[PDB]
Design a protein around this ligand. Structure first.
Ligand code: NI
Ligand code: NI
Ligand code: NI
Ligand code: NI
Ligand code: NI
Ligand code: NI
Ligand code: NI
Ligand code: NI
Lengths: 62, 156, 156, 62, 156, 62, 156, 62
């Protein structure tokens, strides 16, 4: 394939999870520069707030 | 979403080739104290927006461990080793969370990537440096600003 | 559901003590070829019926491996080692699936059990022998008759 | 606690799962003898039939 | 020396068949905190005496860990799972050391056994229950009285 | 093979090892009942005494 | 011998600081098919020559596996993650051997480094890229020309 | 410590090992550039030749 991905892209995300029995839902809205290898996102806990565990374990999954 | 990784011309970019159909990935996170997580993401594209359907499950974390006690500070930068396992692009990583008290907590990552696009050119063994960071967050992390920088390379 | 395990009088039965409130368990299944599964079950009781809300997720299985190619014949009998990890009852097991061709495929189990009943007396280090078997099934396993026998003991 | 569990009990089960991307739902109806450490169950695939992976990986989760 | 294990008639006894030529074994001990040990033993027979040439190497034990700080009390009893791996008799075990403070320290064992005797009949998948104990010892363990009881069985 | 191993056997052992850099030598003299699955042994540290690590890690190797 | 690694000024060089007294290291090599190796090296210095006393032990390699069947071609380049574990400098690595048939064989490395020199300044979490290669060898590898290139960095 | 290690250094090595029961001894004579992060060595099997296993498993130990 000859990629048509643009230098600027947007990102929409929905995460449903459960850690040690704690259910939660997190929504994400972000954007990034595919060819620069950089991206950023605003994450909001919609269900299960406040999370009773380290948020860091979730970050690479967004 | 490995689409957000700077790939040099000499290494086939499995991810940017995976569109418009998209791709998905599965990941196991094995923590040194027994915690085990499984994360999956189905990535699609509509217009100029990537959509992510993510599922995250974690079990067996010690109740007084750094994860359940929220004692982590950040993931250290890392280098993912990319290769094919039984024809499937796989990324193995020696990950580590920095904890309060200036100590580390290790986690082994294995991610498998599966494109839905036909004719994708597969890459050979290579690497992808990563650096993920929470730029800012509110007290309970109900609101988090996340950022990642990734660069693929051939080592040396 | 470890409630279905023959416990001798000298070993506290964490499971039969866990009612009427019930208990839940989480389990990681780590297969020798990279496959990783997470299973959870919330067990409740209504009348004389145990209700089970189970979730099962598996990732990273090689496409040509014994699991995705349906080459397993059965789980061999096993002996689960029960003990407390950071105050939580945990069961570790050296599991093995017999495959066609007369060879074995190993999987390591770690199950954590959490009762919702107050005042439960915790057991010390002990064992639970198991034998699970598919008594019969139709061609594609759409219909399966399952059976398990389990006995707790103090080893020797 | 002084267990009131009976020598004969019934079992109802619902499993929702996903293996290597394959989603499925399995319903179970069984019974057992708690004090004998024995149980049996009839399992039926309600969604995702036919399963494309070894059924054995699921059995200890029922 | 698995020769010292009670084997029932229905399970081929790989070890008692391995004479007069003898057998050897190799073992990896993987402790949950990073400690790794390798032990080997070449067993021979002369008259009615078994001779053992043993080598034991251990590395990566945390300096303040239970091993280097001598905080272990005993190994709990265990059940070894015996099976063939690429034609070699192998025993995998979920081992655990009881520590001071009433907590456990896990170690995974994998032993491979290799007979030098021709025509030995190989056993199928089975189990060997074990219980090893230091009956008595002097202050610094310069003198130790050791004992082991082992029984092979078919589970269920 | 038709085992000629007797109900009572003797044991001689020599262990050479190194744990976390600490070198040691242990000699063993024991006996056992092969068909009973029982054995015992007297162990003596000949070099490297006193051991700076848990003796327990060594026991299954004798 | 990590003394042979290019360290930038902003990262304390544990190894070049470890002289004239020297340092030693211990390493566990855990291969994905069960093979386990332990290697140790005591490094000393006399004049301008580093002396190495090395011990290498390997067990549990399947007889028909890539190691015992000599099917390896080379180690791929790698990135070692350096950090302190209970006060001891440790390096964890996701290693992979390229095999004949264009497939990979994984091995996890954990090396602990211990200096004998007093007052050594310890580095924080960092990385060391590596590339080891057999430049040439005779038929049976009785004679081998080895080479390694290593560079320390802070990732990102 | 203020390192007195030179830009050019020599290397002498002796490896004693045993893999899957096969005993061997390898001697090494090399040199390297510490500040360049490069080294090379001539390795010779003194005992146990020819090795019945992949030489590659040994290389990072030299
Ligand atoms: Ni093209
Ligand atoms: Ni903060
Ligand atoms: Ni059948
Ligand atoms: Ni009571
Ligand atoms: Ni005592
Ligand atoms: Ni015969
Ligand atoms: Ni060559
Ligand atoms: Ni200074």
């Amino acid at each position: 394939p000859m990629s048509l991905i643009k230098p600027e892209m947007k990102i929409k995300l929905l995460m449903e999870g459960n850690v040690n029995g704690h259910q939660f839902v997190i929504e994400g809205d972000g954007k990034g520069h595919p060819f620069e290898g950089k991206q950023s996102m605003d994450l909001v806990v919609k269900e299960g707030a406040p999370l009773p565990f380290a948020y860091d374990i979730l970050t690479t999954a967004f | 979403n490995r689409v957000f990784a700077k790939y040099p011309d000499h290494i086939p970019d499995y991810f940017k080739q995976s569109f418009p159909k998209g791709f998905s990935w599965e990941r196991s996170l094995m923590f040194e104290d027994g915690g085990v997580c499984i994360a999956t993401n189905d990535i699609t594209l509509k217009g100029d927006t990537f959509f992510n359907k993510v599922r995250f499950d974690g079990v067996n974390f010690p109740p007084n461990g750094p994860v359940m006690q929220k004692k982590t500070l950040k993931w250290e930068a890392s280098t993912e080793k990319m290769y094919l396992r039984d024809g499937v692009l796989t990324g193995d990583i020696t990950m580590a969370l920095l904890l309060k008290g200036d100590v580390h907590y290790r986690c082994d990552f294995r991610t498998t990537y599966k494109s839905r696009q036909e004719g994708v050119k597969l890459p050979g063994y290579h690497f992808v440096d990563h650096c993920i960071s929470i730029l800012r967050h509110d007290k309970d992390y109900n609101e988090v600003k996340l950022y990642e920088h990734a660069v693929a390379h051939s080592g040396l």
